[PDB]
Symmetry: D2
Subunit: 251 residues, 4 copies
């Protein structure tokens, strides 16, 4: 309770799934939140479901849209004051091996999962540093930032990039005393409506050879590690990877 | 607040420093705690400083003492009910390169830092599994479980061992549905009275080439990640390494 | 001696530095080699400096040029027969933090260091699979695929991406029994004429806080690990990272 | 051919399997070799199977025997001159989870797999430093130094320890300009006569969920990486881990 007192957070892809759970717990611990998403119909319903406009608002945005990032920050500042916390959560996947990935698929995925994370991280550092906010940038990877999957080629590329880029940003921010931390979170498989929509997906992910726990996680498993990283409890963590994966990467 | 509702924790080396901060925050979040340490004079004062006997007690023990482990568990059960949570925190260091380590130094260090962790982990699994406790075993490494230090040879050995042994235990516990998670925590340098006692130590550890933040951490930086791992918030994390190091290992 | 009997290799950025040493040793070990580079004057002179056209040729190419990759594979086949070995070595750097990277610098570095490696890996799998060649794709990272550097933000993103994408491609090729291995090489600092042109650069890179050996490496340190990976000596190695760094990443 | 000109190597557990293939290739590449093993009958026959006494000899030793290590180095010097290269290959396994490991099994496995490697590394540094030998210490781990296995608890502890202790020793040797490199080798599953004696073992280890290549390796896959590490070809490699696993750890 009140673990995020006074924080102001942007969560990209905050209207569904993992993003939405992050938002929900952020609001519960006292943060002001701006969630983003591509569809206003979903976005505005999501925001209202979590709380009132003085707690949480929606902002329509594609994380691959560089200019929209500037608008997003300005809007969040107008609503809630200076942003302290950024969760780069929006992502997409392509279910293809490297061999079978088209160039269009490659660029589309990178623009969200890599360029978007870059735009958010770069803008977040510039806007959040040197303000005594206890600022924190939480970049969503994946277990796919640690291990390959033969049918997630471009996704693996994007998540390996976010992993190491985040260390670079962490170190610069530390060395320059910016009061900004940057860390990555690496979910294993997580049960969401989208997973429920793909027959047999949870069942495959729940095989012991994939997830040793023999079941997949839930959105709140990611929201709780994000609360920790956004909070000043984690003021000495920067440049680190936080895995919450049911044992996936342990074997 | 009440993040450790109903938990019963053993924290080895709980009377000083990082251990003591863990204990303090554990009690604050509603856990019952048994702290261990080598000296009763220090131990009993430490326990009373944190709370009353129905919250926290001391138990004298050297973590390298296999038979004492059994007593420790029995005592903790007698005081507080079934143990749910084990923090293997007790450790020592030897300030020697591998080349310059005597065999006596080697065995002494291993007996605490490796055998002790093994005895605790093995006994913890046996006593905690299959009880619906939400059991959690948190094994203290180190940044020295990731990277070498030329003057910490045996220490590096012990911390690399704990790191991977912990994954083995994690996986067995998961695959057998024991309801026990095992994870490791990897502090960077942390300011304690013992560090304050070694002239120039904090100053050396605070050089940017060591810790990018340009200062070292404090005991509560470790206590907070331990609260998370002991709590059911982290029910999908097992077999993972959690680093809190000021950027040390990021560069 | 004759460690690469019968192999046919493409080495991108093969006209200078690391690439040129790889090419030199490849030819010494009996491979046929196509080197690429941006300047025809340089490339032709480099090929002739190594051997005759029956051993080594040049093909002008920018590794970001998708169509030109098809032309390079066609050309190499026409000269030497079916390609067995690809070294994705071309790369560029931007000396900027994430915070200070322009979008143009981001895209230009990614086009070479990431898209180019994708284009080469994808086409290499297509062309080399299922031909009993003992095919091997060697993707040049860097130490910057393991650790961050505060002033190499885009470069870190690109080297992280190559690291994990290469595991994805390894796994698919193994699972499909393609007779293609994929592995990464991670040089630390290496002395080249370009380093020699920057006063003080080698000395800085040779500080013990950077390279524990107290000096930097030479192009042949990367050529020898590449001969191992290209040869059938490494037939059981796939999806692995091979680091040759003077200790940089060990501390 | 002549890749180990002038070298003098000790290989522990050199009479069978991986060790014997290392010894065979070492001799083929011009090294002088002392192999160790427990059974004199086996050892003498193995040495003679590889070459003559001017190329290779046997010394009976249990790698847990501290004093015998001094005797082994003395003996090797007397036969061949100053030792340049040490391969710490001897090891044993216990097929138990952490939970089910007796203390006796723990101590017996650690004495060989951990203390023995310490004793060899320590004495090797002492003996090989500062002699212009291009000295190289190659510590055999395993994939079990990266990932856990639920039924190899003590083995995982020992392989984690060797992994990181070896980085400590690398760093000290580099920093002190000792002309000693230390690196680890991490085999995945390898076909030997001992595997062949367990019905079904190879088939199980060859499942794609274990080894993506769908088959296991052979002793020469580990011998070739060891020739690279022992040779001056790898003069800039220290403190690194070299994995040869058929993809095991990539997924
Ligand atoms: Mg795995
Ligand atoms: Mg480092």
């Amino acid at each position: 309770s009140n673990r995020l007192d006074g924080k102001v957070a942007i969560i990209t892809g905050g209207t569904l799934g993992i993003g939405l759970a992050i938002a929900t717990k952020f609001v519960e611990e006292g943060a002001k939140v701006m969630i983003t998403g591509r569809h206003s119909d979903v976005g505005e319903k999501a925001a209202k479901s979590v709380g009132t406009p003085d707690q949480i608002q929606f902002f329509q945005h594609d994380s691959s849209d560089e200019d929209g990032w500037t608008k997003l920050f300005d809007a969040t500042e107008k609503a809630f004051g200076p942003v302290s916390t950024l969760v780069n959560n929006a992502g997409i996947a392509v279910n293809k091996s490297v061999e079978e990935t088209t160039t269009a698929e490659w660029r589309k995925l990178l623009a969200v999962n890599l360029d978007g994370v870059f735009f958010g991280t770069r803008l977040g550092i510039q806007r959040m540093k040197n303000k005594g906010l206890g600022a924190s940038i939480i970049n969503m990877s994946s277990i796919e930032g640690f291990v390959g999957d033969p049918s997630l080629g471009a996704y693996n590329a994007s998540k390996g990039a976010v992993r190491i880029m985040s260390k670079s940003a962490a170190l610069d921010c530390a060395l320059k005393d910016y009061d900004v931390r940057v860390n990555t979170v690496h979910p294993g498989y997580i049960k969401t409506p989208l997973v429920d929509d793909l027959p047999g997906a949870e069942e495959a992910m729940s095989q012991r050879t994939k997830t040793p726990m023999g079941h997949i996680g839930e959105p709140n498993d990611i929201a709780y590690i994000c609360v920790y990283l956004a909070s000043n409890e984690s003021k000495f963590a920067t440049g680190s990877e936080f895995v919450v994966d049911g044992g996936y990467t342990a074997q």
